[PDB]
Each structure stands twice: as structure tokens, then as C-alpha cells.
Amino acid sequence: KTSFGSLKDEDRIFTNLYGRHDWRLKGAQSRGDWYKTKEILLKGPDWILGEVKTSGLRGRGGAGFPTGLKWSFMNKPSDGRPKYLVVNADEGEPGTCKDREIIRHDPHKLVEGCLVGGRAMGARAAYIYIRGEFYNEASNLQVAIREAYEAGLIGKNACGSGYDFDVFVVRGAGAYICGEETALIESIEGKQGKPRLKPPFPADVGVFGCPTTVANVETVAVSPTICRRGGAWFASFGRERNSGTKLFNISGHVNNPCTVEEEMSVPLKELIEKHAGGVTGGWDNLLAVIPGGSSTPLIPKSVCETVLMDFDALIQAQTGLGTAAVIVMDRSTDIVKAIARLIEFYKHESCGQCTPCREGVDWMNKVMARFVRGDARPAEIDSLWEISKQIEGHTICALGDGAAWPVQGLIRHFRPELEERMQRFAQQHQ
């Protein structure tokens, strides 16, 4: 197979993504959920982990780590401590709203995924870290959790298999840095959302010191479908080591911003011209595209023509996949102002525990504000690049790298616009 995309409705993972059907237990069980879960729980954690590993499912959070190996990290005998599975439902990344749609429209799929994942790694219970701002989503999730509890699917003797499994929902308090898995673990324990250092990994010391595995909503809710349809069914899509279907949130200067499921290795041009309704003012009006939300560098029109929206093609285009969040900027935009606002957002969401991010993000904010104003010298632009090289790779967590990447991409792709802006200011003001 060479042409990737044009996914039929028979292969979409998340039916009722648009909320047109019932989201409760009677609606979810009529769409295929909660079917033959007892045999899945009874077959074996080794079989479930092997089926996940053969499927080639990778990280849907944006890190790109393979899910099967990471889930099999905790497949070890216990030392007397309980084991925990935690679902990351914070989703503080700009441009990203797919997990909100999953927790608002398919909560029972998330609960069945929690049960299947907890069976796979022998977890004692499940914790869902919902976002604080998603109050209605959390209420709907807890309604579905109660409806699944009163049906005997979870709890004591879950799904009639003799395996106990408990589920919890914990609300956040408005912090994007709580989306990091170690900062999420620290936030559940009742401290500030300040990340830990690896090693020790969460598979050894996690929440409450117990072995704990943290996984995204989109990589948990697909696990019962992974077990039911089979590994090769998910491996049929995309390129090699890029299998699966992805939710894409397209927003920006676009006629119809929307969330849509598609194949992994679909070209970006086909997706943005088919599902998004096209760039405003035609294709020639397009100026830049950020393919993964605020964590990834942008790419101009010269790279956006024949780019495949998977991990390998995007990492070959000196950017990252991110959370498949397509932010589109046309020619009627102040691009430097947009990157300055992104950097100011990164300044307003940074825990401040470790020094290089805590100082360099503020320094980058001042430099980019002066660049938007234009009050600098041109060589300082190159100096700003060096500041990024003093942040990327010297931080506790990846928020500093996630702030250094868009500045590097903006400089590397639109240095002429920056320098012409500031020399125009220098001419017209001095």
C-alpha cells in the first residue's frame, strides 16, 4: 500500500465522536463496546501485552514511545507493593482537544480501556487525572463510571472474571505542567505539580511509591478494540512502525476547524483540503502550519506540500508529530506575534523547579517581545538561537525543550521577516 488515507467508517475507532448517539452504557454497548470483555480478562496479561506489541501502537501523548514495550515494563512479579494505572486526561496542549471529545462522548470506551490495561499490567486500581476546566466532561465520566459499576462490569468481580479493579477520577487545578507524567504523579500525591527525575522510572517508583504506569486517553481507549479486532488489523494502517488511526484537531485560519479521525500516514495537504474545508483564501494564502500544537516547530508552505503526517516523515522535516494538532496560519497573520504569544503562554505555564527553563523562558519572552517590537540588533537573533541550545537538553522535564523548539523553527524558517521588521523599525524610528 502506498496511498494512505480515505479511511472508511467501518475502521474508525471512535464512533459517536461527534456526539450524535447516546454516550451512556446502553448506547456504548450498542456500538460494540463492552463486548466479550470477560474472555479478554481471562485469556491472560501476557497474551494482551503480546497482542498490543504486535499491533505496533505507539505513544498518542506525543512522545512517540511504543505502547506495548512501555506497558510490558511493569509485567514483573510484585514485591508486596500494589500496582497502579493512571490515565492522563489533562490535555493542556494548545490546538489539542481530542481527549476532551473522547471523555465527553465515549466514556465507557475509556473505562473498558482502563480495565483492559489494568489487566494487562496487573494494576490494582485506575486513576483518571481529568482536567480541572473539564467539569462537565468529568461529571459525564463519573456518571458513566457509576453506570458501569451498577452493571457489575467493574469493581469486585469485574466482568465476572474474579479480578478486582477499581477506577477513580481526580480533578486538576488549572496547570498545564501537570500534564507531565511525573508532575501528574506529584499532583495526585498532594504536592505541587513539579516533575521528578528519571531514574527512578514510574515503573519502579510512581504514585505513592508504587509501580505506576501513566498513559494517554487515546492510547488507553483503543486497547479493547486492539484486543478484539486483532493486532494485524491495527498494523494494516500507515507505514512500518507507524501503524494506527489518529484523531486530528485542525484549527487556525481554516474555514471549518474540526476534530476528525484519519489514517496515520495520510498527507497533510489531503487532510487539510478534505476535512478542514481548506485554508482560508485558497492554498496560496497559507503561510505556516504547526503540526503538533505548541510543542513542535512550524513548517512553511514549501515543506507542507508533500509531508506525511506520521512520526518518521515529520521527524525528517526537522519538526515533531506532537499531539496531531494542526494549527494553520495564513498570509494575513503576524507570525512573530503568534510565536511571541506561544512563548508567553509557555512562560505562564512553567513550574519553575529547575533553573534553565525558569530563567531562559523569561529571557526568551523578553527577547521575542523586543523582536515583535523590533528594538534589537540583528546578531541578537543568532544569540537567541544559542539561548535555545542552552535550554534544550538541560532540563528536568521536556517543557523547556518544548519552548526551545518553536523559537528554533521560527528563526530557521523566517529569519528574513524578523530582520526586515527590526531594520524597518530602526529606519523609521532613528
Binding site: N16, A173, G174, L342
Partner: protein
């Protein structure tokens, strides 16, 4: 805008505050949600519970939450100051947050912000003199495909126009409660030009399963 506290007559440890017995039962359930030996893990929602008791957090819910969980008060102070949801200043009855992040400013959220400013007659971060509306700006709230948007109390209002937000304001002033949903043609996240996907009905259980399961 200050991360340190000074003793005022309206904000001191001697300010009276207490939990209702139903809220005590809720706090007990929240504590029982966590493993034994880790009572401090209940400090995150319970303090937020106190916010729902008052609308803002003086330093009397801080000490009370520290007392009823056997934690030092400075941990509660750290938790309240680190997180932006916990209002340590008395906000208005309807807290309005406007998203000014790049995928929201791309769809001209500045016009909506200026419409709110010229309607309520306030500034950024200022409180209306009838103690009803508070207007601040925050980061991305997860409604990027329905940008621009606002968040009033615990209700999302997405795909807004200046006419839409001024209608929301003058209907909120009348005592009623608006509809927490997008105000465009689409309902939640579908494209406005019809369903580009999931036009076919779902296929139900027992579809595409493998042998041996």
C-alpha cells in the same frame, strides 16, 4: 498578582469559616478515595471544595484544610499559590475567562475581549462594581476547534461572536443562565459544512472480531 499574604480585616486566620456536615461527608469520601498513609493526597479537591463553599479562599480554609488532614499549613499555602484556579481574592459572582492563546487569537479573540470591555466598562483583571463579573485572561482551555471561546464559572461558551458575548452578558445580568454550548451551526466538533466522516451508522457488537476471542 502577589504571592505573599498580609493580614487584613477581611482576610486573616481569625476570619470565621467552617464546612457543612454534608461537605464533611464529601471530604470523608474524598479521603477514603486514597490509600491509607497518604491522607495528604486529599488536599487537592478538598481545598477546591472549600472554594465551592465560598467562591474564594481567604486564609481560613487553608488552616482548616491543613487541620482536618494532619498536614502543615505551608503545604496548603504552596498548593494554593502554585495553582491558578484557587482564587485568594474575592472575585465576582460570575468569573469570566477569555482564551488569548495563538489558536484563539488566530480567530480574532481580541475583538471579543474588546466587546466585553466596552460592554461591562472595566479593564483586564478588574471587577465590576456590583460584584457580578470578573474578567481575566488565561491559556488554552481545550476548545481550539471551536475558537474563540470564553469560560464563565464552570460553563464553556464556544464559537462566540461580539453579538453572542454581549447577548450572554445581558442575559446573565437578567438572572437567567445561558446555554453552555457552541453558538455556531455545528454542535460539538463536526465541520460546519456537513459531516465529512461518520455518515454511516455504527455497526454494533460482534463486528470484525478475531478467532479465539
Amino acid at each position: 498578582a502577589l504571592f505573599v499574604h498580609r493580614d487584613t480585616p477581611k482576610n486573616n486566620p481569625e476570619t470565621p469559616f467552617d464546612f457543612t456536615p454534608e461537605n464533611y461527608k464529601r471530604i470523608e469520601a474524598i479521603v477514603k478515595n486514597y490509600p491509607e498513609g497518604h491522607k495528604a493526597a486529599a488536599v487537592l479537591p478538598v481545598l477546591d471544595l472549600a472554594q465551592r463553599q465560598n467562591g474564594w479562599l481567604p486564609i481560613s480554609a487553608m488552616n482548616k484544610v491543613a487541620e482536618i488532614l494532619q498536614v502543615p499549613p505551608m503545604r496548603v499555602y504552596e498548593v494554593a499559590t502554585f495553582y491558578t484556579m484557587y482564587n485568594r481574592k474575592p472575585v465576582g459572582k460570575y468569573h469570566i475567562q477569555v482564551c488569548t492563546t495563538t489558536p484563539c487569537m488566530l480567530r480574532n479573540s481580541d475583538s471579543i475581549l474588546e466587546a466585553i470591555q466596552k460592554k461591562l466598562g472595566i479593564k483586564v483583571g478588574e471587577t465590576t462594581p456590583d460584584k457580578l463579573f470578573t474578567l481575566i485572561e488565561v491559556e488554552c482551555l481545550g476548545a481550539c476547534v471551536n475558537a474563540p471561546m470564553v469560560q464563565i464559572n464552570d460553563n464553556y461558551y464556544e464559537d462566540l461572536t461580539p453579538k453572542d458575548i454581549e447577548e450572554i452578558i445581558d442575559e446573565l445580568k437578567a438572572g437567567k443562565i445561558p446555554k453552555p454550548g457552541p453558538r455556531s451551526g455545528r454542535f460539538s466538533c463536526e465541520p460546519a459544512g456537513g459531516l465529512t466522516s461518520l455518515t454511516e451508522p455504527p455497526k454494533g457488537p460482534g463486528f470484525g472480531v478475531q478467532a479465539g476471542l
